[PDB]
Design a protein around this nucleic acid. Sequence first.
RNA 1: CCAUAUAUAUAAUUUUAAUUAUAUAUAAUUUUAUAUUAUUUAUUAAUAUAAAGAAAGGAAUUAAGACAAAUCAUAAUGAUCC
Lengths: 234, 84, 96, 66
Amino acid sequence: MGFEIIARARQITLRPENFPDEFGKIPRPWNYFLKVIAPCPHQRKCPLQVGNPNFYTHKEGKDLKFCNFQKSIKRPKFSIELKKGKLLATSWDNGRDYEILNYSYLIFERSHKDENTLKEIKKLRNENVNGKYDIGSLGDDTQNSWPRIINDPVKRKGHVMMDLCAPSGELEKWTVSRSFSKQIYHDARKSKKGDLWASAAKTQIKGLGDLNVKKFQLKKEERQKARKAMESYN
Amino acid sequence: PVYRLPPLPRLKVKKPIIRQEANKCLVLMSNLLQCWSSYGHMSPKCAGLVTELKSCTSESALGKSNINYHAARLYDRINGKPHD
Amino acid sequence: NILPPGVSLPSKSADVAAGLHKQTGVDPDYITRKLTMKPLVMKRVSNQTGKGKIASFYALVVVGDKNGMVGLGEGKSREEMSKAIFKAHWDAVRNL
Amino acid sequence: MKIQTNAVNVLQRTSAYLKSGLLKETPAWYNVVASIPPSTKFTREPRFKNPSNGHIIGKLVDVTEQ
RNA sequence: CCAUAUAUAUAAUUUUAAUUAUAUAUAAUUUUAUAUUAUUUAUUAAUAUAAAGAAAGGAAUUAAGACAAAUCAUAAUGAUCC
Ligand code: SF4
């Protein structure tokens, strides 16, 4: 539900459908302009958004994925002393010194106001064919367009698999191998969910985290078929 | 006056009350405590009660109605319903 | 062979006649060679239950000997229309 | 309860079964019931005298007789 | 079916533990008699007291729904990648 709230809030501010074929981050109208800083590396349609939260509750949207991020926070004493006993320490049907919190979040900046900035946004929207950011692209190759790691990467000997929300507007799977590059593999072997991946990879394919997304009178036919078959038996 | 009822789906008492016989042990204990309140604690005037208490609580400290069955069994017979 | 005693090695009117002769003592020969059945209505009815809709086949048939004897029969089967019609034929012969 | 028809006409229905051929063998009771018919009127019958005291039921005394 | 109690068989009683071993069978899901309580009135139940009993425990054995699980190391197939 929280992810759906952020997704909708992103959509209404941005209107992705109103600027098709516009890759990159340019401030967007809403004299008023605003741009997504984090966690999104693009301003196209969010790849994980399915409009209605209730779809997650069903038995067909149990494989759905949503954009959240995790952190660990030390438990202060008062927290440790609170979660004790049959109320808060048992299973309602070892402990830690920290809690993992899940959260969704969104950050926008509003542009400044100036004859420079206004015409700058107009010109950059007009004559800048930044190009179709294909799968595997890093966009601007800056903080503002680097892919977003949105799943815990899988780290096996000599290769690291990352699920990214890419600046191409899409949901990508990147594999970094030692044989491709020792340095980039070394960096990838320490990457974590929530980072921005700033380097290229060897294998860059379409991520299947959105698989269970696109898939989200008969009474009269039953009645007529019943009567037709019943008169056909004879 | 006689108040005849309509044909009922049943004839049942919701919470039939039963003969809860009082425990002898508790009665003896209450009498003994009353005796100690009036005639003083460890009084000899009701040592018998103490004895009796000791004799009755020694092994164990503490020493259903059938109306619905018969009502269901007999309702069709007595209800005075007219013949089919 | 190991045929159990009371078992035989490995049409509908014949089975109706045999069953009804065993159950009611009516003549099988009359049923098989002098009665004509004619289905009158053949329906799919349905009942809503907690585990979905359960469909049943309903058959109303008439049987008679064209000589002043007639009987209506109703049959109902959750599996096949053959079975509902068989039961309707049975009932019709019983209601002559 | 409705006056029943099918208890007192078992002979007629049995004879229809026998004539049609639906029943082969005549039952053992058939000739007995044929020779001893059931009562099949089931009427309410008036009474004109109290059996116990002899009082006449259903007489009106006219003004000429008073 | 274990276990428990008993019977038969087997052991040339130095492979000795015959107070044993392990095959087969039997036994109980105990039963009878009163007394007091209640009773749907006994040919019922409980409690108590007597009588006979070694008799007092345990395991397995079917489906149907719901959710979880990839050390699913309870697999197979498929997809994808090197
Ligand atoms: S980072 Fe990607 S998946 Fe997450 S909210 Fe933004 S667009 Fe959607």
